[PDB]
């Protein structure tokens, strides 16, 4: 006997891997396979369009890239411009229809059924397709109002996945170009800034961290310095080396990074808090400016030292040229223990070249 | 015709798949439940951390309700993550009969999840109550509820996992916008503030909900520029000198340097305002002497904000203007240093203004 609830629950269960899903290819992947078994059709084909090639868009099999397709051509060219619903019942009698990509593989298209895409304020933002009918000769006015609703969540899912990685972008933009706001006093760089949250990044991957903390290292580390702000001229643009009463200034930029971060509630600002007053602790107790020890320092703050020490040894600074990885690998064996977590200076060594491709791939 | 629930979970799941609020996602979930257990009632119930109960929200959009996570029906499900099915409430030991009696409802059936967060915890509860047979909850009922929680709890950690991206985003711009606290007197809340206005000026000129909200936290980034002027100008003990004051006016280029280019159109408008700021409408403005819309909407809108902010500010010998005198102000620079049709707007929602300053102080 069958299950009079199965294809709720085929449904509900698509809908859960979509909810989790953040990748774009992989929504519409499931959304595809969904519409196939929901439609009991043998074929579906999403079409999105890009507003910079003028062009529809789709995926061909799991794990390769766009097929471009005509926008004005075809059953989802008809579809795309005049917002209407196609249903063919015999495809070879249609001259909307490309009988080509059809007669190269051994595949024979009869049934199609094309409704459109919308977007929030009702504009058309695509095509949704299903091929060959499987239990019918026909695509009924039951399919068609199922492709519809079906059509209305393909939509959602795809908008909010766009929208989230909008939103996600543009959190980096703001944490990397803030953090640079020290710019015009102070000599590092905007890729330094970038470059020290994706070596811990690898980091606490490899550390076997959560994931959302993976996330958050890659994202609090960038503002490890940001205490310069409150940092005086006559300290912060002195050039050369330093004396024993402005060094202490200098040292409190620490501090200072706290206290501009500490005030959040987000998980986000109590670590780059924290990394902020703690970069420049050592493994030792042999840093600054408490002289922190071991464990005392968070794995956060352990992470950074690292990654930042990394980033300035291979860069041009005054004196100084870049040191290579051989030496850059040697430095670090010799301060395991010391100015380093030991277990941590393993896993940077261990992942010693996605850190310098890090570096090559962002000057 | 069995699709019938089939596009109802599609309608329903369309409207999740918008939702931002987490307070709707519930309540579009148990909607959904209702239709498609053919139930009466459902409720969720999620954990908290702190507090240490559990909570639900009920319809209608009040505060939520606080729940004994040892006690109760919930409660049982919550700690043993046993799954619950009661043909007769009024039967067992375990139900609380008050809810009934302040409702005037009559509970019978109750069917009760446990919710499984990613890692496998358990964060809440599903609770479906009343099939509409007037009989029990059946084993296939079981089962679908089964799905139905596991669509649940998807959803809920996707819509937890974007309010503290949301969270976390405000957060950073707040405080990093602030980061001239050490060497400049504006304060965390004006900065604020000053996007608040801005939002509800935005809104009520007839701007898109999205640039609303662009605005709300671009605005708050104007002045960053400052943290690029010499000491030797900003924390100088006298007033400024004419070749000071023109260094000073160099923080809204500094500012639009260090937004510019960054490719978000966050970050654009961020660096026009910060950048526009005060530049006004006639054009007598700095640093370019900008003229009407020739300054974005957005310098435009945080002009009359930050203006707004100052004005309504306790200074020593300085005490903030009320609402009459402030009206006054505005209709006096209207044209002037204000863009007069949003400057209208802004009057027209003053009320509005006057509220914020008094909520967030
Ligand atoms: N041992 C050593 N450390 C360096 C050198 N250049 C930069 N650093 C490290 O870089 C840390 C801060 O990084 P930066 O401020 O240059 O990004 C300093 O605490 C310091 O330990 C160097 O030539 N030798
Ligand atoms: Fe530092
Ligand atoms: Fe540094
Ligand atoms: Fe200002
Ligand atoms: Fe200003
Ligand atoms: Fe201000």
Redesign the pocket.
Known sequence: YQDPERKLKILLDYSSKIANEKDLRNVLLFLTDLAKEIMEADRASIFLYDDQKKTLWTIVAHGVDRIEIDADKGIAGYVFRTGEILNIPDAYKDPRFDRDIDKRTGYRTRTILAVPLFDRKQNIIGVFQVINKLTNSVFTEEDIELLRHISLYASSTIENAILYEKLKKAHEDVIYRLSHATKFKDP?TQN?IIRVGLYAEILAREAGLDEEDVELVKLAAPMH?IGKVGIPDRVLLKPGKLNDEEWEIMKKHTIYGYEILKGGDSRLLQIAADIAIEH?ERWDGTGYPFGKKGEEISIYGRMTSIS??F???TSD?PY?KAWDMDRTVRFFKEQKGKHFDPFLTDIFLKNIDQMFSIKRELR
């Open positions: 590092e330094h310095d420049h930042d020490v980033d300035a040894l600074r100084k």
